[PDB]
Amino acid sequence: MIKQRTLKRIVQATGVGLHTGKKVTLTLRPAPANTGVIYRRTDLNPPVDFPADAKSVRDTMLCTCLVNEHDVRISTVEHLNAALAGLGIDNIVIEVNAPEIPIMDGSAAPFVYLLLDAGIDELNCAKKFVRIKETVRVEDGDKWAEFKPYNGFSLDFTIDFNHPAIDSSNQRYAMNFSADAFMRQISRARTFGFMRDIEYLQSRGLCLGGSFDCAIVVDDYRVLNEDGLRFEDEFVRHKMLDAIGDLFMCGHNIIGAFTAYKSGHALNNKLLQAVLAKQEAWEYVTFQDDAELPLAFKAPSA
Amino acid sequence: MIKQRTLKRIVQATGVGLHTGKKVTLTLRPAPANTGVIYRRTDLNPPVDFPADAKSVRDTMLCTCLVNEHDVRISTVEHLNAALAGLGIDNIVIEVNAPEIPIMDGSAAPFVYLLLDAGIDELNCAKKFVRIKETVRVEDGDKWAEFKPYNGFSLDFTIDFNHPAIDSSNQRYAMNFSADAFMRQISRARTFGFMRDIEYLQSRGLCLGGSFDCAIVVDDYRVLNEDGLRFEDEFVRHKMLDAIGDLFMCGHNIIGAFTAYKSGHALNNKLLQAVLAKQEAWEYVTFQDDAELPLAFKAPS
Amino acid sequence: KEDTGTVEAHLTLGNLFRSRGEVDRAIRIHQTLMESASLTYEQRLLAIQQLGRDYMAAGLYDRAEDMFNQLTDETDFRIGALQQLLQIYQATSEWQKAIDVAERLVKLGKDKQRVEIAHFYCELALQHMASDDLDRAMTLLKKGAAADKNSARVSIMMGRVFMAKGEYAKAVESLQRVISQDRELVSETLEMLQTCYQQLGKTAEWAEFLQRAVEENTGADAELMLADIIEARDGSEAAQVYITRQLQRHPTMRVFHKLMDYHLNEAEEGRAKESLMVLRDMVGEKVRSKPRYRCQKCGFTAYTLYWHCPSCRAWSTIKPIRGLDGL
Amino acid sequence: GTVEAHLTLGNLFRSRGEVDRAIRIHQTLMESASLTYEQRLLAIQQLGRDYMAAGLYDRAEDMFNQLTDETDFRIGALQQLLQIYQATSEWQKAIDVAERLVKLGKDKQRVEIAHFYCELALQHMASDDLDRAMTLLKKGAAADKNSARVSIMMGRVFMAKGEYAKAVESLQRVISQDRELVSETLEMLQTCYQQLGKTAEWAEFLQRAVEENTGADAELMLADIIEARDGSEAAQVYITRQLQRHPTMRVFHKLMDYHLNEAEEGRAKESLMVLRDMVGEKVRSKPRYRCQKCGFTAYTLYWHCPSCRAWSTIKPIRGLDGL
């Protein structure tokens, strides 16, 4: 019955926010069964609990950012959400004492490491799944996203940046979602960004904490990172990582086929809201995806 | 005493000359004891031979390039010489059917691979080293090279390229020369050029065969190669590789301390000619250098 | 690694060794795995491909060809092996075999490699022209044009060989085709089209073609040539209107330089002359400094038209730079 | 060796981005009881680098704090701690680490100490705490006398307080500290020479700055004042002289603007108008400040270059591009 999951220990990690550049102290904590991922601002008077819900998203400039009625915000929850979806965490309390989830290395690998270090305990209760009965679709001009019925969770992303440094790489990716598949193929894709649009973005108040150590700074004609790309086509891989993170905002893993072309955070959130609006287009189910089983590997001593 | 070495099998390799762009079918062949490395051109119906003597180097615009009296040239012999010096080959006939030793990947690693695949023999004859006796120094303005007496071969090269891409790496590297040390540290640094002056050099008849696959191309501010630098300070390491290759032009492994600053391919050859011109500065000796035996250590999990 | 299993672990270790530059160890690992008697056909082909890539990255080209010629007949690796062989035959300057491999690849479906066939044929014709043999150069140019009919290099080379032979009418016939074959490279033919028309003596048709070229937005070269001929045709001051009009639609440094020169030629002297001197000494001091041709795949900038861009090694990518910077 | 078999697989895994595996390998090696002291320190350093690459700064700091007492690793550990404290906007500790590094020999960290003090002052500035801002800037000046940021910040603080004589006295030091950045002071300096009331000294200083090839901004300001003083003719003469001696697109646009005012109406004037419409757009579109270590071009002065993260390496672009 798949069974719900949570953490075993209160696991912390400091970082530098990508879109604010302020020191942040992420503190993942366990929760009982039937709690859902609830984000929490802790530096505020009382706390400001943001129950993960597609409607909370109200700012999608370059980071799916929660905003309650009082303008208290927690930005850049895309990658942490992607990690939680990868490990299938349904009950976890995320606390940040600064108004944004840290960035770590610009991917979900650090968050996967933190969650695994905490340990994925399994609770005694069925795991709620959002199964897509009827095909739904949303469009934003030349960008579009589409949810289709499926006996699983499959993603199919395409990008087109008309950029000499990104077109050379693979521009289409597709997979059947699974804990091991996510951990091995998508958890490492970095936060690709262009060097030309940094002066402007930093002026506007975004990407104040981004540096070569947490992004693929692509200049006008080539990737500027010394190491290079972790994957030969990690731009689309990271875009699908952001897609998983955005789609997890509903609080539960989704069952369906998600096909996207040039989708962003705004489009993914709009698609999720559209699906959740049609009461007949989605239903609650259990035991539809083969998550878990993060197989270990040999540890030779030499 | 250290024994002279040659190859056990004739070994071929077809590459592209860096400074000509032609297809060169390099062929390394063994020679008997007491013959010295001799370069040779094969496309010429009468085969023409260049004995390895410092005086042979006559054009050094960007690469130590042998030239005889009739203007028959074998350019870019500064990397193959580097590999031979690293492995201490004393008798070998190098043949090229086009006027340039190939460049391979820019470094001297492919030549070490070719020589090791050929297999290095040990002739039953003494190995002549050219050991220095008196300090000899030559300067070309700011650039200066210096040989000092020493019980071995030790290089202390330096570089001062006023360029943001080369100034962030150690502009100094010193090592105690030895076959294993050479094969491990210096025998992979690639030839590095600037993309700013490639439109010009190719117009002057140089760097025609160059490309990202056989050089480190540092643009105005950073290294453009997708792989990146093999080391952290590959530039000085390759400059010292060129230094070893150029110093090998005397035909024998040299013994001493070679300290250089901004030394090119002309200054090294000038230093070698000056050293060999003084009869009281150098002498032929035997068995005075560190081990030249490669170590097959790598065997991890 | 060495803890990821076998065979595939060997392949990953060899790839890492090649990337780090330790070429000898990469070949040693790949060859040891290939010589293993416990490998399957698919694994042997994978090993041979990796060994060929190792040799190619180490510069030993004939060994790379030997290790890649064994994958062309294999369905899985045919296209990749042929691509690598095409790269080898490009680098080692063997144009005929490169053409043969490109024809194989185009027969296999990849139709993008027809421009490269035309360029290889043009390179062979250039080699022949270096030995003063125009007939064979024309034959190779005709074959290349038959291979691809949307290559400006073939037309320019045909014009060059015709001018060498003296068939100037055919030289014009071939050169003018570049207008329809590729607009961005029109400026390359004007230097020779002028000579062709001068030898033919059809000055009126030369002016007509220049007018058409400028109306078609060919570049600053056509505008300058047309203005130069007009100055002699119908005076300077009276005919300065045309340069002014062409200026407004497509202003460029190379154009206003001529207008400043015209102002200098007929001026009222005094402070205005001193100004129009200090300027017209500066626009002209960055008209020659700025690069004229740029590669639209890797940003390479050069003062001459490199058909084979040195950086990315892509054929027919360097084109004139347009907009307040040159042609 | 067996130990060196680890710390090379771990480095590979970290480079590939699989921090979950590199950290695991290094931690397992560290937990082993067979590690010698030096090997244990090497493992600690590798684990700290793993954490820093993965972005878990609170753990990289903890790991690197175990190496500051070991003679061999003191430089590396302190440098990594400085990078961590710069990254996570914590300057009051970055200053301590940099001062320890200075005491341990590295004398090129005085610039970064001055910049940390300036950043702290900036934090205390904008909250109307100018007294502590000035105190911190004075400390930074004491830690380095060859920093232009300290002088400019002190000028700003004096201007906010109101003491303009001291403002000009401090601002003028930029010429002796770093000439390339003098163009930054001019704007501010102008105000402190206008409301102060010393116009003659302002003109004299502008003339001196121009003669010292200060830049295009100084030349333009000098041309404007010469115009307002002695008519447009003298201004045009001076601008022509400076353009011939020092060519800059901005001065070229100024010369075009002065030419337009003196020109008989005609289609030539309209051609000059369109030339202005293009050249002014180009000059307003070109970058102003460029970094001298990574080729980053920004339209406003960045003290901490975003790309190479090196302090005080962004200087005004000099030549035919901009200033």
Ligand SMILES: CCCCCCCCCCC[C@@H](O)CC(=O)O[C@@H]1[C@@H](N)[C@@H](OP(=O)(O)OP(=O)(O)OC[C@H]2O[C@@H](n3ccc(=O)[nH]c3=O)[C@H](O)[C@@H]2O)O[C@H](CO)[C@H]1O
């Ligand atoms: C100097 C030292 C520098 C140090 C480090 C700097 C970097 C730091 C890391 C963060 C950088 C950020 O800057 C994030 C960053 O660069 O990535 C975002 C990325 N997510 C996505 O944008 P996103 O979906 O968030 O939001 P938009 O509403 O803007 O998307 C709609 C708009 O984007 C176009 N679009 C969108 C998606 C697609 O598939 N194709 C495509 O064309 C679409 O045509 C329209 O124009 O597209 C862009 C692709 O990198 C960026 O904006």
Ligand SMILES: CCCCCCCCCCC[C@@H](O)CC(=O)O[C@@H]1[C@@H](N)[C@@H](OP(=O)(O)OP(=O)(O)OC[C@H]2O[C@@H](n3ccc(=O)[nH]c3=O)[C@H](O)[C@@H]2O)O[C@H](CO)[C@H]1O
């Ligand atoms: C599209 C991309 C296609 C691929 C292009 C990439 C390259 C492949 C093509 C082959 C290029 C080769 O040729 C390698 C190449 O370019 O590197 C040569 C290199 N050997 C050496 O050459 P050389 O010894 O003759 O010195 P120069 O006088 O020429 O150097 C001038 C000034 O440099 C200072 N200086 C000089 C020497 C020294 O020891 N120290 C030092 O500081 C000194 O101030 C002097 O005045 O110096 C330079 C350093 O890379 C280059 O010239």
Ligand SMILES: [Zn+2]
């Ligand atoms: Zn993202």
Ligand SMILES: [Zn+2]
């Ligand atoms: Zn070299």
Ligand SMILES: [Zn+2]
């Ligand atoms: Zn290119």
Ligand SMILES: [Zn+2]
């Ligand atoms: Zn910088």
